[PDB]
Design a protein around this ligand. Structure first.
Ligand SMILES: [Mg+2]
Ligand SMILES: [Mg+2]
Ligand SMILES: [Mg+2]
Ligand SMILES: [Zn+2]
Lengths: 108, 166, 152, 171, 290
């Protein structure tokens, strides 16, 4: 079917600008106590998560170097190590991954 | 094309006498030719329309719409220049005075329908405008009380005249 | 009408549904932590937990081997399942996987969840932490607890 | 090497000329007359004079001088460029001035209204010796390393620390 | 007469504040470094005896001002609205901090102050109200308390539940006004000029003057009411969201002079309890605390 008459600006302005079609204010925002950036509650801090994922990205890169080719996932557990630290007695008998930097504060 | 909004930052007022209220600082800023619909931009403009800078940046951060990051940029640019050039003491004590989107210049392409028929498609562009006023944001007008309704009704009855006499 | 419909329809049909979930599960096994759409993470999550229980049955179980064969596409992960993952979760009876909601995807604006198997080698996810016991409200509640215990 | 070019230069009477030229330059800044300033101040100097002053009001005044102005050194160039001989003469001036700078909204942002404070300044003057239409103009200021800091500003500031990318730690 | 007394004390407070303001030569730029976990190495170039931790906060963001309750200046608790003295390291303290020990202490100290404020102006002039002090009480204890001497006429008088609800709404009114807690640190003498009428405040001032090597004492003003405090307070009254004056208890060895310990419990806006939980907290504050 086809419109029988042009809708006026006022009619349209009532459609468009009612509270239903408006953007609602979010009330669940907070400050990330860790980094001090803004995070939504119920959601992980975007900054903090990026930080983790950049670290874990590099760890996965070192995993590839040592593994060296597809279909070579080991049958032991894994541990990650940084500059100036040694595997414990219980750490013995599992895969070691080395690093060229200091251990992060948040990663313990 | 007109570019009035830019020039608004070049207005110089003469120095105030010590016996005067401290004039709020005043920053006008915009972005032109945003590839986004002007009416779509309106909703985001309308949202931040009366809030403080930080509170607007907060609201804009978690907003999913495309233009939301664009407005965030404009606001941060405006805040930066406010402190640097417009002699604003604190960056936090700014609120959005007016937030407006205009139609920018548009192009026309063709859309190919069935049979031989076609239509004229428009690559939509728009501008965004903002104004920042130094100081705490204005407290919203309180909702009208029963006593206020009553008060004004009394006023209204008292305004009656005997009509079409001397 | 669809009350108490448990599984959510996913791919281009039930066969595809399984296939997507199997891919997700394969990834998670291998890498131990995976970002994917919130619905799909939630959906796959259950099959991930059920896989550890089959893994707990052991290499010797022929049924469990056939299951692992289907659900792991890499075939090199099957030893890992049975000699790494199953031994790791010996104590716990359940609750091997954790899922969290992270910021929405940039391109798509989709809800995104990270899922990881617990006790992995990787750097730990920023996790929601309840406020310290030394907070004003917690101290007042600890006060009330003191009253009740010391009354008898 | 000045005299051979002009032959009507006196070292005795120049300091007064240097003084009044200084004052009228600052009066130019006050009323925002750039044309007179150009006749009066070199092309090196003018950007340093006027880059900040635009979109704000200056209220500069000259109070009586303490120590009379005197020349400290005179030096001349030796044909570094074709048809160009320049002459730099340096004057020490010790005087009290008043200054106020207002904001774009006219809010007093620096200095005081009408109370003088003493200043010691070293000023350099250039002339085109070759050019017949060349004129003595203020060229620059010399700041001593031992000079006391400029009087403090009205507002408070924040200096931002390093803005760290997620993959960085503060030192 | 009390109505003139209150305004007299204000005039005296104001003139001392003006005196302390005037001895500052124009403005000296002090440097303050942010030593917080968040946004590190920020340096604020502040006015010497003018700028506050609040001013530093409001350089950063509204999130600081909204959720900043105390300051550490060289690792000492410092009022939000207290003007600084010298260059230092500054960090801000919130309620949801790991160790909010100092923050909790400051909160209760402030609530007790405003309870005393509302009690004073709750009775008619024919009766005598005498505020003595607010003793230091652990937050893990039932509630905050202020000790009061009333008239000999009201020796038999015990407050009813309706009277308690009356105080409740009265203190609530104060919160609604949203009054900043102005602070002033002075020598003992000028403070004695402020409080010479009540001896119960005279000796307390003398106590603080004696214990400190200097004769410095802290006076906290909430709009009009001046009171002697033992440490730093909360910035504004708005911080409180729940506030009920729970009970009044008579102390036992009070044959020479009766002491009435007013008790009430409060929670700040950031840490608000559900209806049921708050109710059980009121129950505990009804018990006499020592
Ligand atoms: Mg065709
Ligand atoms: Mg069209
Ligand atoms: Mg679909
Ligand atoms: Zn964070």
């Amino acid at each position: 079917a086809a419109p029988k008459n042009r809708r006026t600006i006022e009619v349209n302005r009532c459609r468009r600008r009612n509270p239903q079609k408006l953007i609602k204010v979010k009330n669940n925002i907070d400050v990330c106590p860790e980094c001090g950036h803004l995070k939504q509650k119920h959601v992980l801090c975007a900054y903090c998560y990026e930080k983790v994922c950049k670290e874990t990205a590099e760890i996965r890169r070192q995993i590839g170097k040592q593994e060296g080719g597809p279909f070579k996932a080991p049958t032991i557990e894994t541990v990650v190590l940084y500059t100036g630290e040694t595997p414990s007695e219980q750490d013995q008998g599992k895969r070691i991954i080395e690093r060229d930097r200091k251990r992060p504060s948040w990663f313990t | 094309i007109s570019r009035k909004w830019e020039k608004k930052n070049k207005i110089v007022y003469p120095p105030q006498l010590p016996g005067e209220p401290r004039r709020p600082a005043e920053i006008y800023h915009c972005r032109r030719q945003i590839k986004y619909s002007k009416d779509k931009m309106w909703y985001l403009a309308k949202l931040i329309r009366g809030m403080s800078i930080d509170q607007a940046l907060a609201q804009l951060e978690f907003n999913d719409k495309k233009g939301a990051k664009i407005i965030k940029e404009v606001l941060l640019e405006a805040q930066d220049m406010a402190v640097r050039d417009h002699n604003v003491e604190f960056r936090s004590n700014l609120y959005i005075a007016e937030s407006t989107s205009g139609r920018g210049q548009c192009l026309k392409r063709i859309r190919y329908h069935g049979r031989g028929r076609f239509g004229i498609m428009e690559k939509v562009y728009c501008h965004y405008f903002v104004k920042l006023v130094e100081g705490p944001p204005p407290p919203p007008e309180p909702p009208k009380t029963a006593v206020a309704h009553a008060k004004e009704y009394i006023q209204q009855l008292r305004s009656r005249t005997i009509v079409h006499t001397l | 009408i669809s009350h108490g419909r448990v599984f959510r329809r996913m791919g281009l049909g039930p066969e595809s549904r399984i296939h997507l979930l199997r891919n997700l599960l394969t990834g998670l096994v291998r890498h131990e932590r995976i970002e994917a759409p919130w619905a799909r993470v939630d959906e796959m999550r259950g099959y991930a937990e059920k896989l550890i229980d089959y893994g707990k049955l052991g290499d010797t179980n022929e049924r469990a081997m056939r299951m692992a064969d289907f659900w792991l596409t890499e075939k090199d992960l099957i030893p890992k399942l049975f000699q790494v993952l199953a031994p790791r979760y010996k104590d716990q009876t359940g609750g091997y996987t954790r899922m969290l909601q992270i910021p929405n995807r940039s391109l798509d604006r989709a809800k995104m969840a990270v899922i990881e198997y617990k006790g992995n080698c990787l750097p730990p996810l920023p996790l929601p932490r309840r406020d310290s016991h030394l907070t004003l409200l917690n101290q007042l509640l600890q006060g009330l607890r003191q009253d009740l215990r010391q009354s008898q | 090497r000045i005299k051979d070019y002009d032959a009507n230069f006196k070292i005795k009477d120049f300091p007064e000329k240097a003084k009044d030229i200084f004052i009228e330059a600052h009066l130019c800044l006050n009323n925002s007359d750039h044309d007179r300033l150009h006749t009066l101040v070199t092309e090196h100097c003018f950007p340093d004079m006027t880059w900040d002053i635009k979109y704000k009001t200056v209220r500069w005044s000259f109070v009586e001088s303490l120590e009379p102005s005197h020349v400290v050194q005179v030096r001349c160039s030796s044909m570094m460029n074709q048809g160009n001989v320049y002459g730099q003469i340096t004057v020490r001036m010790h005087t009290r001035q008043t200054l106020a700078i207002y904001d774009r909204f006219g809010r007093l942002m620096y200095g005081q209204e009408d109370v003088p404070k003493d200043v010691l300044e070293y000023v350099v003057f250039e002339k085109q010796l070759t050019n017949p239409y060349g004129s003595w103009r203020m060229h620059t200021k010399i700041v001593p390393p031992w000079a006391p800091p400029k009087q403090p500003i009205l507002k408070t500031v924040m200096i931002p620390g390093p803005q760290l990318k997620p993959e960085e730690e503060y030192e | 007469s009390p109505t003139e007394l209150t305004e007299m004390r204000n005039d005296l407070f104001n003139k001392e504040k003006a005196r302390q303001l005037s001895l500052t030569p124009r403005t000296e730029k002090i440097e303050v470094k942010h030593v917080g976990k968040t946004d590190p190495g920020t340096v604020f170039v502040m006015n010497k005896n003018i700028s506050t931790p609040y001013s530093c906060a409001m350089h950063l963001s509204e999130w600081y001002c909204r959720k900043s309750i105390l300051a550490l200046v060289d690792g000492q608790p410092w009022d939000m609205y207290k003007p600084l003295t010298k260059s230092c390291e500054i960090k801000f303290l919130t309620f949801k901090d790991c160790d909010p020990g100092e923050v909790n202490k400051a909160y209760w100290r402030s609530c007790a102050m405003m309870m005393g404020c509302v009690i004073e102006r709750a009775f008619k002039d024919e009766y005598m109200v005498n505020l003595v002090r607010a003793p230091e009480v652990p937050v893990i204890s039932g509630a905050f308390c202020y000790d009061v001497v009333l008239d000999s006429k009201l020796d038999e008088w015990m407050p009813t539940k309706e009277n308690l609800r009356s105080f409740t709404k009265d203190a609530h009114a104060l919160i609604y006004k949203d009054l900043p807690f102005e602070t002033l640190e002075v020598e003992a003498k000028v403070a004695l000029e402020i409080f010479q009428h009540s001896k119960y405040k005279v000796d307390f001032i003398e106590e603080k003057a004696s214990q400190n090597p200097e004769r410095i004492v802290k006076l906290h003003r909430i709009g009009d009411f001046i009171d002697v405090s033992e440490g730093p307070l909360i910035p504004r009254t708005s911080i409180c969201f729940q506030y009920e004056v729970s009970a009044v208890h008579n102390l036992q060895p009070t044959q020479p002079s009766l002491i009435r310990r007013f008790q009430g419990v409060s929670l700040p806006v950031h840490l608000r309890a559900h209806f049921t939980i708050w109710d059980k907290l009121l129950e505990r504050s009804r018990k006499m605390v020592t």
